[PDB]
Structure 1
């Protein structure tokens, strides 16, 4: 509905991304979460929120 689809992008240069959703009007900052990257096989900071 309101909430919009985003991709969380790995900082490990792998190209691996997660996908999730965000409300942009509220919490307009960049969602940064530590997530498992399965190319280097470590937990890694992911960054994007569109």
Structure 2
């Protein structure tokens, strides 16, 4: 395992979010990468990823 389930959140005031995993063991840096936000209907920045 060693791969925790990470959850990306929208920078928008909406509660929409994405989900995936990360190897915190070697990547203790919270991930962000921008994705589509259905609620706001616009590609924005997604954060939170241990």
TM-score when normalising by structure 2: 0.92
Q: For structure 1, which runs of at least 5 residues remain unmatched after alignment?
A: none
List structure 1 segments (4+ residues) > 6 angstroms apart after TM superposition.
none
Inter-partner Cα distance in structure 2 for 1:34 and 1:6: 15
Inter-partner Cα distance in structure 2 for 1:2 and 1:34: 25
Query: What is aligned with 1:21?
Result: 21
More strand by share: 1
CA RMSD of aligned residues (A): 0.8
Q: For structure 2, which runs of at least 5 residues remain unmatched after alignment?
A: none
Q: Secondary structure at the match of 1:36?
A: strand
Q: Secondary structure at the match of 1:43?
A: strand
TM-score when normalising by structure 1: 0.92
